[PDB]
C-alpha cells in the first residue's frame, strides 16, 4: 500500500512517513487538533507531492522574462 | 361501638412510624443512586473506533 511501482517503495514514502510520525508523537485528545501542530509536514509532503510552489517560481519568473521582453526591446 | 374502639386499636398496633421513614428514605436513595449513575454515564464520547487519539488510552492490539 506503499509498494513502489519500480522502487522498493514510492518515491514520496518517507515523507508522508515523517508526517505520521509527527501526528503520533504528538498528545492532544483529537486528531483535528493533533494536525494543527504538524503542519509544516503535511505542507513539504504535499511540496514533494505535486510541486505546486516549484511551479509557481517558475511562473513568476516566466512573467517576469515576458515582462523584460514586451516593455523592454532595447537596441544596440 | 367496642368493635369501633379494637380495630383503632388494630390501626395503632399495625402503623410504625420508623418503618414508613425508613422507607422514605430508601426510596430517596435508590432513586438518588440511578440519577448518579445515570450523571455519570452521560459523558459520552464518540468518534470512529480507529481514531487513535479520541481512543489514546485504551489498550488495543491491532492486527493487519
Known amino acids: 500500500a506503499g509498494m513502489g511501482l519500480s522502487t522498493g517503495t514510492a518515491r514520496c514514502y518517507d515523507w508522508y512517513m515523517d508526517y505520521l510520525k509527527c501526528m503520533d508523537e504528538r498528545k492532544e485528545p483529537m486528531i483535528a487538533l493533533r494536525r494543527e501542530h504538524c503542519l509544516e509536514w503535511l505542507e513539504d509532503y504535499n511540496e514533494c507531492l505535486h510541486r505546486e510552489k516549484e511551479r509557481t517560481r517558475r511562473q513568476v519568473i516566466e512573467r517576469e522574462r515576458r515582462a523584460q521582453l514586451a516593455g523592454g526591446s532595447k537596441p544596440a | ?64
Open chain 2, 1 to 64: 361501638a367496642y368493635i369501633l374502639d379494637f380495630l383503632s386499636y388494630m390501626w395503632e398496633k399495625n402503623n410504625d412510624d420508623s418503618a414508613s421513614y425508613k422507607e422514605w428514605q430508601d426510596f430517596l436513595d435508590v432513586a438518588e443512586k440511578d440519577r448518579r449513575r445515570d450523571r455519570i454515564i452521560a459523558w459520552r464520547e464518540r468518534t470512529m473506533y480507529d481514531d487513535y487519539a479520541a481512543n489514546a488510552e485504551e489498550p488495543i492490539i491491532y492486527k493487519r
